[PDB]
């Protein structure tokens, strides 16, 4: 019932992909892109990252198993070969041996011991050059053990780290020995309440939040910003109401988008529902099948404003 060995390596090994990222970050970004067959990007980023993180993993814990976002399907040559650099500072591993990291990925979840993670949750961010996060999971049967969240554009570089049971801490990504406890706000009204979603217009109803806002007579105007940062935001007390809006019934969610911020903000003492205040669930494979969107709060606010979410959603097919 205790997980500090598992918070440990996942600490550990989300710091050093925050060196990951930043490192590609200092060079022009094109030439590190990729476009998917979705047409969502891929970066020398996102690759080298699950390539080392996938290793220590199987190093420490080989009999668990990984559900991780990327695989090396499709990946261009230069795009490979500059992963292959990138990851030999940190890791001894051959060119063969790194492609077979990342594919170590490609579990489906669900019983036994998981690791979760998207080695850049907000790619687009970190295109953008504004907020990415580096996101570690750790759920044994679907269940929320350990949460990792490295976010290295924001405030100069944070980590956030909860295991369940015991509080969620900060620390910068520099120091990952020294950190404090962190705590959801105390907001107790929906007019003064700081409101975070998603900049892509695509990825959350963007007229509907205004609507919903306009309904809880919030005054503030919205932060929008990519990734889990946005749960970070809401555990550490510097936003009150995370909103992501589906346009319809049918896109599900990717367990790696919200796993480690989910647990973050509730050992923060907030909360974490769907659209539907129904708590998520984790149990259901690599997506949130049984889940619709995303209301993550501070805990008070919270039905107050899915009534309300609801209620506007209430068309939803
Ligand atoms: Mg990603």
Redesign the pocket.
């Given at each position: 019932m205790s997980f500090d060995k598992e918070l440990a390596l996942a600490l550990e090994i989300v710091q050093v992909s925050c060196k990951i990222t930043t490192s590609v970050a200092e060079h022009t970004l094109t030439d590190q892109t990729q476009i998917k067959n979705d047409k969502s990007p891929v970066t020398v980023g996102?690759y080298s990252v699950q390539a080392y993180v996938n290793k220590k993993i199987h190093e420490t814990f080989p009999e668990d198993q990984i559900v991780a976002?990327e695989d090396t399907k499709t990946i261009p040559e230069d795009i490979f070969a500059k992963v292959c650099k990138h990851v030999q500072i940190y890791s001894d591993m051959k060119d063969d041996e790194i492609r077979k990291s990342i594919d170590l990925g490609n579990s489906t979840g669900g019983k036994g011991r998981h690791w979760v993670l998207?080695?850049?949750?907000g790619?687009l961010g970190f295109l953008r050059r504004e907020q990415y996060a580096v996101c570690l999971a750790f759920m044994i049967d679907g269940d929320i053990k350990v949460g990792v969240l490295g976010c290295p554009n924001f405030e100069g570089g944070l980590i956030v780290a909860a295991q369940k049971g015991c509080g969620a801490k900060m620390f910068s990504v520099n120091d990952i020995k020294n950190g404090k406890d962190i705590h959801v706000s105390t907001t107790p009204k929906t007019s003064d309440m700081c409101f975070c979603e998603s900049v892509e217009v695509s990825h959350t109803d963007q007229s509907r939040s205004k609507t919903i806002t306009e309904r809880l007579q919030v005054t503030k105007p919205p932060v929008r910003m990519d990734s889990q940062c946005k749960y970070m935001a809401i555990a550490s007390g510097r936003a009150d109401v995370y909103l992501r809006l589906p346009r319809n019934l049918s896109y599900q969610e990717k367990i790696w988008d919200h796993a480690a911020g989910y647990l973050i903000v509730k050992e923060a003492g907030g909360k974490v529902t769907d659209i539907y205040g129904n708590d998520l669930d984790f149990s259901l494979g690599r997506t949130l099948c049984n889940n619709h969107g995303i209301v993550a709060s501070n805990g008070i606010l919270h039905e107050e404003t899915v009534n309300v979410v609801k209620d506007v959603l209430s068309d939803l097919k």
């Open positions: 996102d976002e998207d080695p850049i949750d790619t």
